[PDB]
Each structure stands twice: as C-alpha cells, then as structure tokens.
Amino acid sequence: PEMVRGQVFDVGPRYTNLSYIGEGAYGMVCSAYDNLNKVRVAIKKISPFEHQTYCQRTLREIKILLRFRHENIIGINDIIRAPTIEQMKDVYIVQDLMETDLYKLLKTQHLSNDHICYFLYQILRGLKYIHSANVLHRDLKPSNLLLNTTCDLKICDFGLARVADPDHDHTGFLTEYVATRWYRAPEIMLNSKGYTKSIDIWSVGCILAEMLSNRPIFPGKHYLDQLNHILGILGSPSQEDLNCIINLKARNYLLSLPHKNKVPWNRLFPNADSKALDLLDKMLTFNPHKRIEVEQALAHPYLEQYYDPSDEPIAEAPFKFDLPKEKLKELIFEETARFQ
Numbered sequence: 183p184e185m186v187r188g189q190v191f192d193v194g195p196r197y198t199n200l201s202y203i204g205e206g207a208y209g210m211v212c213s214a215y216d217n218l219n220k221v222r223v224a225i226k227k228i229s230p231f232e233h234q235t236y237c238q239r240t241l242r243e244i245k246i247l248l249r250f251r252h253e254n255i256i257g258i259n260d261i262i263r264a265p266t267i268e269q270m271k272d273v274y275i276v277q278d279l280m281e282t283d284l285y286k287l288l289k290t291q292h293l294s295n296d297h298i299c300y301f302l303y304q305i306l307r308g309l310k311y312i313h314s315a316n317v318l319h320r321d322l323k324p325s326n327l328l329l330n331t332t333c334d335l336k337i338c339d340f341g342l343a344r345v346a347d348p349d350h351d352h353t354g355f356l357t358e359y360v361a362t363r364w365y366r367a368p369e370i371m372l373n374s375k376g377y378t379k380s381i382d383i384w385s386v387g388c389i390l391a392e393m394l395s396n397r398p399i400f401p402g403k404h405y406l407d408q409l410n411h412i413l414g415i416l417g418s419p420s421q422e423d424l425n426c427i428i429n430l431k432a433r434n435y436l437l438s439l440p441h442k443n444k445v446p447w448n449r450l451f452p453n454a455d456s457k458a459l460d461l462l463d464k465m466l467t468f469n470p471h472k473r474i475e476v477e478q479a480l481a482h483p484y485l486e487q488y489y490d491p492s493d494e495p496i497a498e499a500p501f502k503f504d505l506p507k508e509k510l511k512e513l514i515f516e517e518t519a520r521f522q
C-alpha cells in the first residue's frame with residue numbers, strides 16, 4: 183500500500199507513481215498514473231466514517247458528480263474502496279488531473295483580459311448546468327476552480343451543494359454559516375440560509391474582481407466584518423433594498439450605520455474593461471432579487487465572443503429534492519458499488 187506523507191494510499195495496483203498535491207477539509211489529493219488508461223489522474227482520498235457531517239458531504243458529492251456530465255465540471259473516473267462494508271474505512275475519488283487551480287494561479291500570475299473573459303465564461307457556462315439541475319454549489323472560490331495547461335477550467339467540491347429552496351431561505355440576523363467568509367453574499371449575514379441561485383452569482387462576482395486585481399475584494403476577518411467591507415464598496419443600501427429586509431434585527435443594524443457612498447468600480451479597477459466592470463456591477467448587487475441570473479451573465483456583451491446558447495448544455499434530469507453516521511455509510515457503499 184503506497185504511503186504518501188505519513189498516510190496510506192490503497193489505490194493500487196491500477197494506480198501507481200503517487201505524488202502529493204495537497205490536503206485540507208476535503209481530504210488528501212494526489213496525482214497517480216492510471217496504468218489502465220496510460221495517463222496521469224488525480225486521486226482524492228477521503229475518510230468520513232467517524233463524523234456524520236463528513237459522511238453526508240461525501241454522499242452529496244458522489245451523487246451529484248455521478249449524475250453531472252459537463253466539460254466545465256470535474257467528473258469521477260473511478261471509485262476505490264473496500265469490497266465489503268466492514269473493511270470500508272476510506273474512500274478514493276479518481277478524477278481528471280489538472281495543472282493548477284485559480285487560487286494558486288492568482289497568487290503568482292497576472293491574468294490577461296482574454297484569460298479573464300475565457301475563465302469567467304467557463305465559470306458561468308458550467309454554473310448554468312449546475313443551476314438548470316436545481317442545484318447550488320455554495321462554495322465557489324478560486325481553490326474550487328481547476329485549470330489545465332490549455333486554460334480549460336473546471337468547477338470542484340460539491341460537498342456543500344444543495345437543491346434550491348427559495349421558500350425556506352429566510353433566517354434570523356447573523357445565523358451560523360459555513361461557505362467561505364470572503365465569497366459570502368450580503369444576505370447571508372442578514373436574513374438568508376443560502377438556498378437561492380443568487381448566492382452563487384455573488385461568489386462568481388467576487389472571483390471576477392479577484393481576477394482583475396489579484397486581491398480579494400471583501401476580505402472580512404469574521405462574520406460581520408465581511409458585511410462591513412461589502413458596504414464600504416457598495417455603499418449604504420437604498421430604501422427599496424431595506425424595505426426588502428423584513429427581519430428587524432438586520433434592518434435595524436443597517437439603519438444604525440452611518441451613510442457610506444459607493445466606491446466606483448472604475449476607481450478600484452481603473453485598468454479593467456468597461457464591460458467586465460458593468461457585469462461585475464450586476465453580479466455584485468446588494469439586493470438578491472435584482473442580482474443578475476447565470477443566463478443573463480452569459481448573454482452580457484462582455485462575453486459576446488463566446489456566448490452560444492446551443493453550446494451551453496443544461497441538465498437532462500434535475501434533482502427533485504434534497505440520519506445516523508451508520509446509515510450514511512451504507513448509502514455511500516451502495517453508491518460506490520458501480521465501480522467494484
């Protein structure tokens with residue numbers, strides 16, 4: 183059993199030549215040689231059996247990716263695990279090997295306007311497939327966007343994905359959340375559960391501004407701070423947008439704040455395209471109801487060279503609807519039986 187960095191990697195004998203790529207809350211990811219397809223693939227090892235949360239997460243990403251088939255979404259090539267459920271301690275997801283991700287790329291590389299336009303288009307065209315299936319990613323950030331040597335982009339990490347529920351979206355002021363603090367929509371800290379498609383649009387807006395400056399645009403250090411910088415740039419929300427917030431604690435918080443004017447995008451990005459900034463403006467809209475939809479974003483004059491309505495597929499079968507840790511270990515076992 184090949185061992186990488188103090189950990190075991192039972193992916194053999196079909197997968198050899200292990201090379202550590204990283205670690206995190208998703209698991210451990212390595213690059214391996216598929217002796218069967220004669221190519222190098224990426225293998226995500228996951229050990230979610232001890233905790234229920236880690237178990238459902240493992241289940242949500244297997245179900246979704248096994249059904250999703252899109253050029254701008256990473257897929258599952260194989261699944262490796264024990265043949266019996268008594269010996270199943272880990273799970274191994276075999277996926278296409280990519281060169282880098284947008285997180286690493288932005289840390290060192292200045293992006294050209296043509297690159298920004300192309301990357302954004304592949305983000306919206308793939309997100310459109312995810313939304314046509316009635317699913318929300320809820321974790322769109324540069325680390326979840328994989329790139330290859332030919333600039334082909336790909337979305338990652340469906341563990342926090344959910345079926346859209348607009349009728350069950352309202353919550354109290356400052357309710358607990360998990361999605362990264364920097365790509366969090368303003369309504370999340372005010373009155374939302376993040377069950378709407380408009381939360382993904384916000385995240386894509388944040389990623390766009392990041393590609394333009396190479397610096398995060400709203401880098402809040404905690405839950406409320408995040409809301410404060412969103413307001414430093416966007417300014418104090420209008421009467422109309424406030425009247426939209428019926429939650430008293432949220433509304434009253436916004437009213438207690440001194441007036442802040444909008445920092446124009448041309449001032450934050452004086453070297454950006456007039457169109458890219460117009461689209462950014464529409465994605466980063468304080469009011470979730472006036473925020474641009476994925477199909478409208480694709481049709482924006484900033485993506486006219488790539489925009490094809492016939493070359494942007496939609497999901498064949500959308501998800502109809504959205505337990506102990508021992509139950510979720512049998513669902514996974516039966517979901518991964520296909521690859522045995």
Ligand SMILES: CN1CCN(c2ccc(Nc3nccc(-c4cc5c([nH]4)CCNC5=O)n3)cc2)CC1
Binds near residue numbers: 339
């Ligand atoms: C400093 N590092 C240098 C190397 N970079 C790199 C980044 C990506 C890849 N290829 C690759 N192929 C297939 C899957 C993945 C992958 C799935 C997931 C993640 N990655 C992280 C977040 N959650 C996931 O579920 N990645 C290769 C190298 C990372 C940054």
